Amino acid sequence: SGAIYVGNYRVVNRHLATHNDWANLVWEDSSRDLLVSSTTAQGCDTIARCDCQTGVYYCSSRRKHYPVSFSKPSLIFVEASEYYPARYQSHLMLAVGHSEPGDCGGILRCQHGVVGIVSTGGNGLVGFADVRDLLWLDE
Ligand SMILES: COc1ccccc1CN1C[C@H](C(N)=O)CCC1=O
Ligand SMILES: [Zn+2]
């Protein structure tokens, strides 16, 4: 679990979105595993606007933060789960690191702010759904 709170927006993994997220829907993309909903309280997370390929992510299955090198956002093949059939997920970044399904939502951050959230894993890899291209999250 985990979300990003910026301005009047809440960003979560689309497969973990609640009934309230869907009832206050702003934008969703199944191919990215992202959903954005509106909030009444004002969020104060900072979104990174950069091309960093190093950062730190929170891994709830280890109660630890790990420094990682990650790839640029891209179309990567993601095996079937109970939430999606096997498909290509877009805007995905991989790193060598630990990730279990319950780790989705953990934030990846660089010196400029929030880069994205955990979305995939397995085989000693961890995938992050990038949010750096969503410039409207700041306006
Ligand atoms: C070993 O599987 C994982 C490990 C870490 C995280 C996620 C998975 C598999 N997964 C990824 C899905 C997706 N994003 O397409 C959403 C739900 C899910 O459970
Ligand atoms: Zn950065």
Name the one residue in this structure whose structure tokens are 């973990």. 16
Tokens of 50: 């950069």
How far, in Å, from the CA of 40 to the mean position of ligand 1?
30
Query: Could you tell me if 15 and 56 lie in one domain?
Result: no
Name the one residue in this structure whose structure tokens are 């959230």. 117
What are the backbone angles phi and psi of residue 88, rounded to the nearest 5°? -95, 125
Resolution of the experimentally solved model in angstroms? 1.5
Query: Could you tell me if 12 and 56 lie in one domain?
Result: no
Closest ligand to residue 102's CA: 1
Q: Which of 91, 85, 81 is nearest to 121 (CA)?
A: 81
54 close to 68: Cβ distance less than 8 angstroms: yes
Range of the domain at 40: 3-44
Method: X-ray
> How many independent structural domains does the chain possess?
2
Closest ligand to residue 100's CA: 1
Half-sphere exposure of 38 (CA within 13 A, CB side): 6
Q: Which of 109, 83, 114, 113 is nearest to 13 (CA)?
A: 83
Query: Could you tell me if 58 and 125 lie in one domain?
Result: yes
Distance CA 57, CA 109 (A): 6
Query: Could you tell me if 54 and 35 lie in one domain?
Result: no
